[PDB]
Amino acid sequence: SIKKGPFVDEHLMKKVEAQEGSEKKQVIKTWSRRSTIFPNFIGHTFAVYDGRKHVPVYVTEDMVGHKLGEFAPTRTFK
Amino acid sequence: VEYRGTGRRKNSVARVRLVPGEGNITVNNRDVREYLPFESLILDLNQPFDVTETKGNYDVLVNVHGGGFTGQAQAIRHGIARALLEADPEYRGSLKRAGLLTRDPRMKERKKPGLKAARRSPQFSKR
Amino acid sequence: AKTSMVAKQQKKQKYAVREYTRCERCGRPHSVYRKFKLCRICFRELAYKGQIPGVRKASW
Amino acid sequence: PRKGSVPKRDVLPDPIHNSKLVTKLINKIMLDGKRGTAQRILYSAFDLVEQRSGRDALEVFEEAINNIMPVLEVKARRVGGSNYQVPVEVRPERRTTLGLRWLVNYARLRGEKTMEDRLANEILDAANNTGGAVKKREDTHKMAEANKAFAHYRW
Amino acid sequence: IRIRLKAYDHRVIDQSAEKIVETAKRSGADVSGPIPLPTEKSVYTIIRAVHKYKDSREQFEQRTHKRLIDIVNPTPKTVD
Amino acid sequence: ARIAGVDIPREKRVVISLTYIYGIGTSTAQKILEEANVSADTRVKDLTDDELGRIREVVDGYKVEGDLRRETNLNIKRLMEISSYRGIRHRRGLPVRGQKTKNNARTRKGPVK
RNA sequence: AAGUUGGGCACUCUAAGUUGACUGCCGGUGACAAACCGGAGGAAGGUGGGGAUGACGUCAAAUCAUCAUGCCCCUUAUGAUUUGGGCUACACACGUGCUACAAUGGACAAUACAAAGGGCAGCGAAACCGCGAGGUCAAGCAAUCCCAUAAAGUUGUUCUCAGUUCGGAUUGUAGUCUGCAACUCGACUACAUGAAGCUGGAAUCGCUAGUAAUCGUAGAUCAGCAUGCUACGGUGAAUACGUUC
Ligand SMILES: [Mg+2]
Numbered sequence: 001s002i003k004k005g006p007f008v009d010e011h012l013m014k015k016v017e018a019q020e021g022s023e024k025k026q027v028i029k030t031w032s033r034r035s036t037i038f039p040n041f042i043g044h045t046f047a048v049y050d051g052r053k054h055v056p057v058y059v060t061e062d063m064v065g066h067k068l069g070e071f072a073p074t075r076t077f078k
Numbered sequence: 079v080e081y082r083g084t085g086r087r088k089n090s091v092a093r094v095r096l097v098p099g100e101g102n103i104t105v106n107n108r109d110v111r112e113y114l115p116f117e118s119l120i121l122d123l124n125q126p127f128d129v130t131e132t133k134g135n136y137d138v139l140v141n142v143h144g145g146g147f148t149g150q151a152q153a154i155r156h157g158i159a160r161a162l163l164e165a166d167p168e169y170r171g172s173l174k175r176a177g178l179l180t181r182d183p184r185m186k187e188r189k190k191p192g193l194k195a196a197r198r199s200p201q202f203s204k205r
Numbered sequence: 206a207k208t209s210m211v212a213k214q215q216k217k218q219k220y221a222v223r224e225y226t227r228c229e230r231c232g233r234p235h236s237v238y239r240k241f242k243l244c245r246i247c248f249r250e251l252a253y254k255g256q257i258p259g260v261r262k263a264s265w
Numbered sequence: 266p267r268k269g270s271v272p273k274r275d276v277l278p279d280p281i282h283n284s285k286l287v288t289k290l291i292n293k294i295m296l297d298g299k300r301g302t303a304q305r306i307l308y309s310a311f312d313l314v315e316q317r318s319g320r321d322a323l324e325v326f327e328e329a330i331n332n333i334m335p336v337l338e339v340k341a342r343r344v345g346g347s348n349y350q351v352p353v354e355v356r357p358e359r360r361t362t363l364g365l366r367w368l369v370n371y372a373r374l375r376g377e378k379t380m381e382d383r384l385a386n387e388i389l390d391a392a393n394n395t396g397g398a399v400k401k402r403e404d405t406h407k408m409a410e411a412n413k414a415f416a417h418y419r420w
Numbered sequence: 421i422r423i424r425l426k427a428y429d430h431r432v433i434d435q436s437a438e439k440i441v442e443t444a445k446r447s448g449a450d451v452s453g454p455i456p457l458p459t460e461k462s463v464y465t466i467i468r469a470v471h472k473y474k475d476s477r478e479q480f481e482q483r484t485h486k487r488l489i490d491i492v493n494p495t496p497k498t499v500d
Numbered sequence: 501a502r503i504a505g506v507d508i509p510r511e512k513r514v515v516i517s518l519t520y521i522y523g524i525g526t527s528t529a530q531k532i533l534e535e536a537n538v539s540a541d542t543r544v545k546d547l548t549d550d551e552l553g554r555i556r557e558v559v560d561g562y563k564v565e566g567d568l569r570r571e572t573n574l575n576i577k578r579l580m581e582i583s584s585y586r587g588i589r590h591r592r593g594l595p596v597r598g599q600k601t602k603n604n605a606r607t608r609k610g611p612v613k
Numbered sequence: 614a615a616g617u618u619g620g621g622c623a624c625u626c627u628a629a630g631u632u633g634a635c636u637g638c639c640g641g642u643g644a645c646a647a648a649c650c651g652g653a654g655g656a657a658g659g660u661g662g663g664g665a666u667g668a669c670g671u672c673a674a675a676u677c678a679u680c681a682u683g684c685c686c687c688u689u690a691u692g693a694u695u696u697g698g699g700c701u702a703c704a705c706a707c708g709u710g711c712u713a714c715a716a717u718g719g720a721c722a723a724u725a726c727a728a729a730g731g732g733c734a735g736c737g738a739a740a741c742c743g744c745g746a747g748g749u750c751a752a753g754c755a756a757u758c759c760c761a762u763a764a765a766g767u768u769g770u771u772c773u774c775a776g777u778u779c780g781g782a783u784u785g786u787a788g789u790c791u792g793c794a795a796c797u798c799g800a801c802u803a804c805a806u807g808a809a810g811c812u813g814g815a816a817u818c819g820c821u822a823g824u825a826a827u828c829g830u831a832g833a834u835c836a837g838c839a840u841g842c843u844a845c846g847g848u849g850a851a852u853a854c855g856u857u858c
């Protein structure tokens with residue numbers, strides 16, 4: 001957490017910034033659990049895990065300032 | 079006539095001179111009574127002066143270096159005995175009757191490897 | 206599976222600080238040095254028999 | 266030590282009070298290597314004696330050790346094929362060294378909320394009897410003096 | 421000029437110091453007698469065993485000896 | 501004893517008597533002690549019956565409210581039970597933040613042992 | 614002011630190269646047996662104080678994951694390369710370590726004295742902009758230059774015996790830095806939050822003089838991240854008559 005550009009991974013930006021044209025919904029196929037939320041995000045899911053999961057996570061208007069796609073957990077407890 | 083009384087106690091050298099007159103001890107351009115910081119027993123390094131049957135023999139205006147503070151002290155007590163015996167060489171047979179002039183018994187020692195405080199051992203659990 | 210790893214390490218996988226330091230005549234990845242590039246048991250048989258310089262035994 | 270008689274060689278002079286037996290109880294109140302907080306508290310606990318007692322603490326002090334002075338010891342010894350105690354009278358060098366602990370151990374027990382005043386109520390009320398620590402020396406003073414037993418035991 | 425010498429062995433550096441002051445003093449040069457700078461060690465305390473039997477270790481050193489020699493008269497008989 | 505609800509303690513120093521109120525204590529209590537005729541001199545329940553008026557008018561001016569914004573920590577916290585992390589599944593399943601959830605004596609959030 | 618600038622003063626430590634401790638002439642008497650208790654003068658006690666040095670051998674103790682390795686298995690996978698999870702997960706059981714329960718204690722400004730270390734893209738000053746974590750520039754550089762103020766304590770103000778001006782466990786906001794990036798999974802700072810806890814049952818350890826305890830200093834590992842780790846100084850006691858268990 002510093003100044004200077006909260007570090008969206010750039011190929012994800014390449015997908016979204018021209019993906020937002022029409023009214024279609026084909027979401028991510030990313031498994032890059034690093035990037036934050038740019039505010040210009042459209043209604044779409046994601047796939048943010050790579051061992052075995054593509055958890056479709058909602059882009060809904062949460063606290064978008066979190067520097068994480070951390071809505072998808074990794075393990076269980078009980 | 080007394081000069082060059084070195085004095086060593088616990089990694090803290092001290093070099094002195096002795097000037098005749100009266101007893102007025104001083105180190106490092108400042109006093110003694112309000113330099114030895116806790117040390118209310120400043121008089122108990124002047125105590126070879128007690129046992130040489132004469133207190134106000136000479137003035138010192140001594141020097142000291144290194145160590146702690148009572149490690150930096152208590153060698154002045156050693157350091158004026160060498161130059162004190164060099165002021166008059168009679169005193170070896172009459173200052174070593176209380177056993178005072180020179181002994182360097184102890185310094186700190188090595189932390190022994192795989193221990194914690196150079197004689198202590200770590201606690202072993204059970205049986 | 207370590208002779209592949211030495212084949213990785215002298216090459217470069219291009220980021221800045223992804224590399225690490227490995228033993229010269231041995232191949233351990235932990236407890237190596239930087240004064241010698243050897244490692245903590247592979248240093249010892251090369252510190253003995255006089256062949257490395259500098260090294261008296263001990264006990265200062 | 267199975268080898269005999271480690272030497273003693275301990276020295277204890279003093280700045281003003283002119284007493285070897287006062288630099289001993291500076292060497293037992295001093296915990297954790299801080300001699301730099303002992304006589305600042307000790308001599309500020311003896312100059313407050315004459316403001317609390319009737320006299321100077323010097324002529325009260327030998328009385329204060331004199332009434333706390335322990336007499337008899339019970340060092341247990343399994344005699345000859347049995348097991349019960351024996352009274353031993355203490356050799357005079359050991360007995361003050363046994364004696365001085367009862368000032369400080371009950372100095373940390375009197376809730377006067379100031380240690381240089383809580384500790385000094387056992388030098389006052391020590392030349393005068395029934396203090397804090399005189400109770401233990403009368404408790405162990407009659408431990409085997411009244412309970413006299415096999416007194417032909419060696420150790 | 422204050423040429424500096426440093427070596428691992430300790431008798432080698434004194435015989436080198438008396439070699440350089442010998443080759444300086446045999447010519448006209450008012451050289452100082454050779455200067456002992458303090459000799460620095462460094463420590464390598466290391467585990468002997470190959471597996472986890474720790475708390476049984478031994479240490480190594482290496483000791484650089486550092487002398488000092490200075491000439492103050494550049495003569496043609498003391499050039500190199 | 502007027503600042504927030506009551507300021508209970510009397511005859512202390514005011515610089516720590518303003519710690520019993522919520523939201524201010526021991527280091528911004530030095531800072532918010534900013535008024536002429538206002539200095540800690542063992543007069544907590546004394547020396548002021550009108551001088552106290554300035555040092556809570558400024559607290560009402562002191563934008564972070566003390567006690568009126570007890571709803572905002574549960575606004576933020578309950579907002580973080582949208583299941584991201586760092587409050588999400590330290591409360592919905594209730595483990596504890598501290599990065600080691602069962603190796604040590606984690607009992608500051610656990611009930612008992 | 615302090616640069617120790619000159620003097621070139623050289624002695625005083627100092628920093629690595631030398632003379633000399635050993636039962637020696639010692640008093641006893643052990644009856645000549647070596648040795649033992651005593652006295653003298655080396656600063657010096659009777660292997661001056663410590664390390665390094667680990668006998669035949671035991672435990673079919675430990676390691677094929679440092680390496681080497683007899684033999685058996687894997688043979689378009691029991692190999693190979695990425696990305697991304699994991700090694701940290703959790704009602705629990707036990708080792709080690711730390712920080713505390715307070716007034717010989719806490720806060721607060723002022724205020725002295727070390728050793729051992731590293732630093733040629735590394736250590737970084739001085740003065741500078743920040744509540745601090747730090748940011749910019751920036752001369753000097755291996756006893757000399759830098760990190761680098763040691764800290765405990767002294768003199769003095771104050772809280773005045775309380776779940777408390779004791780302690781920071783926990784928990785959100787707002788940053789810094791290292792990095793391609795700090796969510797899983799670092800570290801530090803100030804803003805409030807301020808829990809458990811009153812010197813601990815049965816039991817159980819560690820230590821014989823610079824020794825245990827007390828606060829500190831440095832280092833390797835390492836871009837960044839240790840309460841561990843091996844090293845170093847400062848303050849410094851109590852106790853050992855005895856071999857019965
Ligand atoms: Mg001299």
Ligand SMILES: [Mg+2]
Nearest residue numbers: 206207208209
């Ligand atoms: Mg192989």
Ligand SMILES: [Mg+2]
Nearest residue numbers: 266267268269
């Ligand atoms: Mg014997």
Ligand SMILES: [Mg+2]
Nearest residue numbers: 660661662663
């Ligand atoms: Mg020797």
Ligand SMILES: [Mg+2]
Nearest residue numbers: 660662663664
């Ligand atoms: Mg020896």
Ligand SMILES: [Mg+2]
Nearest residue numbers: 660665666667
């Ligand atoms: Mg031998």
Ligand SMILES: [Mg+2]
Nearest residue numbers: 206677682686
């Ligand atoms: Mg194999």
Ligand SMILES: [Mg+2]
Nearest residue numbers: 603699700701
């Ligand atoms: Mg592990």
Ligand SMILES: [Mg+2]
Nearest residue numbers: 738760761762
């Ligand atoms: Mg500085």
